[PDB]
Design a protein around this nucleic acid. Structure first.
Ligand SMILES: [Mg+2]
Ligand SMILES: [Zn+2]
Lengths: 46, 95, 157, 130, 140, 38, 44, 206
RNA sequence: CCCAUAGUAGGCCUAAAAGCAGCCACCAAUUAAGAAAGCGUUCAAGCUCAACACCCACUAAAAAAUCCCAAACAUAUA
């Protein structure tokens, strides 16, 4: 499997399918799940 | 390169090489760059300025040559051999 | 085929590159001519064959480009030289500058001419019978050619 | 002609193959740059400049480089390797300093490269430096 | 033009060796010789100093002074003032590997020496090769 | 020119051409190197 | 520096002695080849 | 692609690596030992046809006589272009012993004879140059040969004999007296098999 | 075709031989250059070659005296 990156200079920032799935999951998840995610992120880095 | 070394780059003041490295039809122009950016040819005069402007966006390979006089030499090396380009360049310099 | 055009801007353009006939009679032939069973079966006369391996201005094409057998390359080279001298290729005349118009020259019909006409010196003193200076006719490279007549090619006259 | 008897790779070929793999996997920042015909003095001093800023220079023959990448993830870098080439290798992406010292000599083109397991062009390089 | 010499620091005027070449180029030999005086007095005296001088068309003087030759350092280490004639089975002096490393440490600091390599193992390998070229053998 | 049964290139710039039905060595750098096949 | 102790002496490692698939191995073989070339080119 | 270099460390060089001086005339004259009827120039050599403590040589491909001049030519040319440490030369022909009176001494050489030999820590190509030079300056036809080249030559001759498509050979016809051919042939031709004609030798004849 | 940094002008003899007046050793850094194979310098300085990349192709003689001396011809079935 190849990266196949930089298809064109004017390409409107195409994204891989893998980066898209996590975005949808976060939106569907409730704030309570997000609240624990934010707290753990704060613990790792600030 | 040796032929170009003998025939100094006196009239020309600026040379510019533009190519797309991902494109398959640039190798010739690249070879041309390799020949023009050597001490044997560059040390003939310091008036000459060699510029390499490599771009990613899909465009035809081309080299630009600026002379001291009104002479102006553009050539697209998409379907031109490096040797042919060098010979044409030398002939133009001879004037 | 590639054409270079100068209008100062120089471009290269690819035109229709002719292609080989669909099925050669002898595949797994190394030469182009070896394939068409044309090894010893062509002479200086055979301009259809010879015109294929020459540049528009009459010069021979390189061996690597055409993929000719070395032996066969040499044969075609000399055959084309003979073809030119016999006047069988009128459309492959040298690139003369427009300014230069060739002066009128005495015309002599010739064929099977090995040497360039300028280079040869006249045989003023032909030898005795036992050691005779003979006038070369045709190329020794074409000695291996198929001979229908019982008498082989008389290469020296 | 009868099929040409295959010859076992000269040891050097095998050794050369290993070095490329090691230097490529270890170093995050790889930069494909055309190996221009500079003077020995000039080449040494620019190499020293790179060494000061912790950037290493490597060249590998295309004869061995091409087979390595023809069956790999990084097959998109094959057109980059035509004619003279060199690899600017670094553990960390220190692009700003190499860019600024390349600015001195315009004839040298930065063809492209790969940073953090993703390919990038010179335009992308300058975007990443900014 | 770049001219390489191992003129001794102590002797100010080169005289015969550099006389014809400088004359051919047509540069002031007096200025050139007096330039060496500062460099001589800055460091230890009575030691040869290899220099790689650069001559420009405008007749300006560029002085690039390199560290003393490896030959003299190895001779000093062995304590011999004269190298072996045979350079074969004749060993004029014995130098410990420790002292070889010490001289290698204090050697690789200049671009004239050109050994800018990060591992000093390469440098010491060069020195041990040079020692073998001389009538010097290593121990320990 | 000097007549030679065997022709030898005397320097790098020497070059060997067949003209008028015989071999010649020509040399632009060293004109003395000029040779004619006999 | 431990590697000070770990080094070659007197006799240079012979081509047979030096292991293949090594950088120095090919350096020695190249060196010998240049020697061969120089020896042969003596009369030419 | 790099290739392994042959080692000649085992090879030893004699104390005198140069060709010794050859005298113009023998100190004491000697009578004929060989039969008078025999020609010393005609036919194949029966002696010194094989390499002895040497790798390279000058092979004679024709009969002839060597004067003192030829010896001097050989000696000077070989010694001048020799590296004494690397390579050594030995004479494979005796000093001129056969007198010619109109008095100068000559040595006979038959075809197949090795005139001079050479060995040491060197390849064929190194020595071939000056050896070929000397071979050309010899009266008879001669060429520089290695062990390998001589063996190849002999194998090629053998191969040509075996390979020949011609039903008729000189040997076959001569031995059987097939056209009454012995009338125009020498008795020596039976042994020579048509390869030798006078002092001259044809290598191209089977 | 292309290209050539450097441990060092490798040590002894030599006014000095510094790669190439001579003798011994012939290691060694880069990725890759022989303590240098051929020229050239009083000695230096320099031009090549082998070296790395680039992938290109690379396959041997003649003359003389009244006036040359058959005519000629490569292509229809031994
Ligand atoms: Mg080379
Ligand atoms: Zn010449």
């Amino acid at each position: 499997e190849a990266l196949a990156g930089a298809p064109l200079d004017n390409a409107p920032k195409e994204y891989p399918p893998k980066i898209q799935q996590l975005v949808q999951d976060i939106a569907s998840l409730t704030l309570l799940e997000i609240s624990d995610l934010n707290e753990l992120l704060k613990k790792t880095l600030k | 390169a040796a032929a170009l070394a003998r025939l100094g780059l006196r009239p020309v003041k600026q040379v510019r090489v533009q190519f797309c490295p991902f494109e398959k039809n640039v190798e010739s122009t690249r070879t041309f760059l390799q020949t023009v950016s050597s001490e044997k040819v560059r040390s003939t005069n310091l008036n000459c300025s060699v510029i390499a402007d490599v771009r990613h966006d899909g465009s035809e390979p081309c080299v630009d040559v600026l002379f001291g006089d009104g002479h102006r030499l553009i050539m697209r090396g998409a379907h031109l051999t490096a040797l042919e380009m060098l010979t044409a360049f030398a002939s133009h310099i001879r004037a | 085929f590639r054409e270079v055009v100068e209008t100062t801007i120089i471009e290269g353009r690819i035109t229709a590159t002719p292609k080989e006939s669909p099925n050669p009679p002898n595949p797994s032939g190394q030469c182009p001519i070896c394939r068409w069973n044309l090894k010893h079966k062509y002479n200086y006369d055979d301009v259809l064959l010879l015109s294929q391996f020459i540049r528009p201005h009459g010069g021979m094409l390189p061996r690597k480009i055409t993929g000719l057998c070395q032996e066969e390359h040499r044969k075609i080279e000399e055959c084309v030289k003979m073809a030119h001298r016999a006047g069988l290729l009128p459309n492959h005349r040298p690139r003369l500058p427009e300014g230069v118009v060739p002066k009128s020259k005495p015309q002599l019909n010739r064929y099977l001419t090995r040497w360039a006409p300028g280079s040869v010196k006249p045989i003023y003193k032909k030898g005795p019978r036992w050691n005779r200076v003979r006038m070369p006719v045709g190329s020794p490279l074409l000695r291996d050619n198929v001979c229908y007549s019982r008498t082989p090619w008389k290469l020296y006259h | 002609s009868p099929p040409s008897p295959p010859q076992e790779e000269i040891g050097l070929i095998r050794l050369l193959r290993r070095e490329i793999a090691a230097v490529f996997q270890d170093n995050r920042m790889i930069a494909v740059c055309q190996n221009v015909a500079l003077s020995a003095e000039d080449k040494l001093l620019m190499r020293h400049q790179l060494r000061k800023h912790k950037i290493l220079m490597k060249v590998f023959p295309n004869q061995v480089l091409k087979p390595f990448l023809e069956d790999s993830k990084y097959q998109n870098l094959l057109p980059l390797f035509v004619g003279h080439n060199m690899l600017l290798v670094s553990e960390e992406p220190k692009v700003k300093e190499m860019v600024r010292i390349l600015r001195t000599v315009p004839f040298l083109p930065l063809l492209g490269g790969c940073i953090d397991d993703t390919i990038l062009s010179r335009q992308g390089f300058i975007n990443y430096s900014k | 033009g770049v001219i390489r010499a191992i003129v001794r620091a102590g002797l100010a005027m080169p005289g015969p060796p550099l006389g014809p070449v400088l004359g051919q180029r047509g540069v002031s030999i007096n200025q050139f010789c007096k330039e060496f005086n500062e460099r001589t007095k800055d460091i230890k005296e009575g030691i040869p100093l290899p220099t790689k001088i650069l001559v420009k068309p405008d007749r300006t003087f560029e002085i690039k002074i390199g560290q003393p030759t490896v030959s003299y350092f190895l001779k000093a280490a062995a304590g011999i003032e004269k190298g072996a004639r045979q350079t074969g089975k004749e060993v004029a002096g014995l130098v410990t590997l420790k002292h070889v490393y010490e001289i290698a440490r204090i050697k690789a600091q200049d671009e004239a020496f050109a050994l800018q390599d990060v591992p000093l193992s390469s440098v010491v390998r060069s020195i041990i090769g040079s020692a073998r070229s001389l009538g010097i053998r290593v121990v320990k | 020119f000097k007549n030679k049964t065997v022709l030898k290139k005397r320097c790098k710039d020497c070059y060997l051409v067949k003209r008028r039905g015989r071999w010649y060595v020509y040399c632009k750098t060293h004109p003395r190197h000029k040779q004619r096949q006999m | 520096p431990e590697w000070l102790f770990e080094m070659n002496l007197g006799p240079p490692k012979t081509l047979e002695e030096l292991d293949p698939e090594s950088r120095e191995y090919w350096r020695r073989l190249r060196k010998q080849n240049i020697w061969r070339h120089n020896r042969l080119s003596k009369n030419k | 692609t790099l290739l392994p270099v042959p080692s000649f460390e085992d090879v030893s060089i004699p104390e005198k690596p140069k060709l010794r001086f050859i005298e113009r005339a023998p100190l004491v004259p000697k009578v004929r030992r060989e039969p008078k009827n025999l020609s010393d120039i005609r036919g194949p050599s029966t002696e010194a046809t094989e390499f002895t403590e040497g790798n390279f040589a000058i092979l004679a491909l024709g009969g002839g006589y060597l004067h003192w001049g030829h010896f001097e030519m050989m000696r000077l040319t070989i010694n001048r272009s020799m590296d004494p440490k690397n390579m050594f030369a030995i004479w494979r022909v005796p000093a001129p012993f056969k007198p010619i009176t109109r008095d100068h001494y000559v040595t006979p050489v038959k075809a197949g004879r090795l005139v001079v030999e050479m060995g040491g820590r060197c390849e064929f190509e190194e020595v071939q140059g000056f050896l070929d030079q000397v071979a050309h300056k010899l009266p008879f036809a001669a060429k520089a040969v290695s062990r390998g080249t001589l063996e190849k030559m002999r194998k090629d001759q053998e191969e040509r004999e075996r390979n020949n498509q011609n039903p008729w050979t000189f040997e076959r016809i001569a031995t059987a007296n097939m056209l009454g051919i012995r009338k125009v042939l020498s008795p020596y031709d039976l042994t020579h098999k048509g390869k030798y004609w006078g002092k001259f030798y044809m290598p191209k004849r089977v």
